[model samples]
Target: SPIIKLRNFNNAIKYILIDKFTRAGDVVLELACGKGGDLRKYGAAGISQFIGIDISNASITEALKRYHSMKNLEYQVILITGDCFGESLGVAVESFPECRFPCDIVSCQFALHYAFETEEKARRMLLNVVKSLKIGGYFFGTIPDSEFIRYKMNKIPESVEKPSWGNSIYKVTFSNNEYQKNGNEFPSPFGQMYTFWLEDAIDNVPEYVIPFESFRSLADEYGMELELQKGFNEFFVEEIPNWVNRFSPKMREGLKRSDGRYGVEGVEKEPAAYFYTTFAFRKVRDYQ
Candidate 1:
């Protein structure tokens, strides 16, 4: 429940698209694009075709099911079960009848941190974007900030509280004392790696911290130039209220009564939750 809230007006997509990011006839690529949660959004954004990639077959299956079943046919959707760093991205792109090697837009929302299993793996993910993104096209998504994790790691481990009626439970924990000095590598917080009382099942995902400095360097090698990188609340402060207000009546009631904490959705949940640094990059030069 709390996790879902972060997806609300959360990232570069949410930040930039509030106005208008993609128009009709644009082919978009999304990495770790989980089960079509944003399919309707992309369709509404006026994209001509959408390509979604994820490691889970079940998620892709569900995404395909939802994309086809939606009443309004605004855009076409193709989902593939594959890793973000795979060379298969090029293959998948080639599979499209009209779509080509590079797409107009590429995104990875709330999941880039998973690529941080190692710096090399992360570099491959970035390079894959370069290989498949059209020059001047945008690459954007949300990722866990290395600095934020380091800051949190210094604090004592404590139970992260949740709404009394919340469907999920969370607690923030650290690996051990003597924080690891390698900024490039940090263990996932307990909130993601291990949690309990979840209404839906969750895998024991390891959230590798993305070192901003090194990540930027690696991205540069592939022609990605930084556009904006800011704290979740800082970037979404103005949009968050609007997002919360737009929630359906039934959802509003649940949020209003959840733990009796109203008007503080992000601030309250952010500290313990896996908040992201909404970042964007652009492929300035053509890929070889």
Candidate 2:
């Protein structure tokens, strides 16, 4: 049941982030929201309006089904299938009177890195994130840490025919074999592509790396100020104590181990969880 446990652990992290940053009646927009996995989290946060967008039509259909299944749902919901990088989300929801632009929160989980496939795509994605965001609103999400990815790549021995890193539950393989030979130097800051696979979760999918410094600089250009950024490992260490009691009993039980420790064991540790980091940015100014 490591997969189920891992699922709960990941959910717990997201739950903490959503619960900490949002309050009742806030409007929220989620980008690349596959199958609406975080619907319950936003629901529990007492959000007034929820908009979920993704690139896959099938996933959006599944998300709509998931939305209808919730009982006594009080919030307005809008689901759209479109490229968050290629299309303007602001315009996508423009016709919906129920959608309140300049929302209080904008979130994208485990999917923002896809924009790094090109500078234009990345900038377009950031525009969507900030365009409908209130000046003081928060934008937050989880993403693969490029620094850690490079660090792991650097640790691989040069004698290995293929350079890769993985644990029991997940694997990451760089598409470019010359990566290791070149001392882990990326061809460029953007479009450093790799394939990622996570058991019972993500199948093998191509993802791009968003170098932290470069991403920070770009976000700053959009008038988003960094509020917080921490590796998942360190985030758990700091947040677990404060939010543990808020977790539902089932979640708490799932994360608890026989050693009397109260956190995810095994797969959530080491190279797997370390692959990701969580970030929050405040929209500080309007675009010209």
Candidate 3:
């Protein structure tokens, strides 16, 4: 039951994005939208068009299967196997001939850090986000905080610690002096390599502790204005009222889809236990 709870916990962003922001006739593009997991959320929100893209062909296929499997859909959807960088973005943009440039909202949830292997890829992806969104439209998504990661790394000794809420075991370690690190540079003295398992054996998913300050500066070059970056604890506080108001009575009850109960699934009694942060960036108004 708690595994289901954690799954819902990891997924609450989709509700915030689609329920709070989507309007009729708005086109929403979601990057790294694995398996079309959030399609039902977007479909229920009455968005005019949806584009889901992932680099994995299998992911795109799963999304497409779900899209066609549903019946009498009110909105249009295009699921594509694609990359988020360079010529791929150009092709994705061009694929929607009637839609015009800059959709209303662009979201990449929980997977942007894969680009940290190189700054170039990350820059290209952020530029694609800016280029793909309307000037006034917003880019909203979640990313782990680099500073917070550094703080936690310092707090952890060489040993692993269990998170209070879930089965996951989280560990962090750094080679250099903990007191000697500063700023947004990657592989810093404060940089801590990490490994996590919800209940697993072992695997390392490369996550570069994202320096939000530096990341925001880079996004600014592509005409994206940083709007808000805060822990999900604060994000849901500001968003939940609006999100709930839009839901029908039945759907409100259905929100308790974690195993079998009646409440907003994944929301914890202790919201502060969430380690990730929700971030918003607006496409700069004057950018041509």
Candidate 4:
């Protein structure tokens, strides 16, 4: 799922101010911004004053260059190259606004998976983001799929292919691992390295993918509401725009990814795929 990964990288930043925060002119802080893709998206949205924190200095260097040269999007950009787990950083997010101006919104995508080894720590890290918000601010994050939590995770080509934002785009290809399911709706990319189910693997693992209940409880605990949640089936429907008829081309050939053994009842058109959760939480009223 390199496609989905790369494409959505910057999408969060673009939506932070334009959609989530939407406070006209409010400071924003993006944590664990790999390669500063999301930070750049914020710049393009006409939000120059931003603080982007990441561990990679090389990446921060490039981000700094983008800020300097991309006149259309560069203005007041600061890059803090450091680890997010440092006590200083935790304290920074807690009091950055009090030190300067409160951040209208805070976002971190694909970066939450490593917040902690246990779920409790993960929940607290998410709550910390809410604490940093300037009341009613938005929190948008994309977590890894739970089913793939058993196997490795992924995204598809189309979703990963970079979106042609007037600012930035990426071209990425990975070493392939082919997999062939008995009856799959989406065939492996031909002759590709990781295509066609090519692994000798074992099973009988615990199921830990996030379900609706997990999402609801977390939202309730933080007083944040869900703005959007992508269904596990959305990946399979790239070919069919409509929900009722979401069979990709390979699916059109009459096949199913087959979740029967797992007792996962997939529809006639949907395939056996993982769900990548995307939920936006906005603080409840009374916090202006």
Cα lDDT tens digits, model 1, 115-166, are 7666567767887888788888888777766676656554433332311112
TM-score ranking of the models = 2, 3, 1, 4
> Worst 10-residue stretch by lDDT in candidate 1?
190-199
What's the true lDDT of residue 212 in model 1? 79
lDDT of 2 by residue, 1-288 (tens): 767877777788899889878889999989999899898899899999998888999999999998888888888899988778877775666666677887999998998999999898999999988887999999999999888987888888767765678878888887775667776677677787888888878898999888988889999999999987898778877899987788888888888877977766776575435778889999999987
TM-score of 2: 0.94
- How far in Å is the alpha carbon of 129 misplaced in model 2? 1.1
Q: What is the C-alpha lDDT of each candidate?
A: 0.62, 0.85, 0.64, 0.46
* lDDT string, candidate 3, 95-133, tens digits: 656554568988777776665546677777887787788
Flag regions of model 1 displaced more than 4 Å. 1-20, 86-88, 91-98, 156-168, 172-203, 240-263, 266-268, 271-274
Top candidate by TM-score:
2
Highest-scoring model, lDDT: 2
User: What's the count of clashing pairs in each model shown?
Assistant: 0, 0, 0, 19
TM-score of 4: 0.52
Quote the positional error of residue 175 for candidate 3 in Å: 9.6
Better of 1 and 4 by lDDT: 1
TM-score on alpha carbons, each prediction: 0.75, 0.94, 0.77, 0.52
Model 2, residue 167: distance off in Å is 2.3
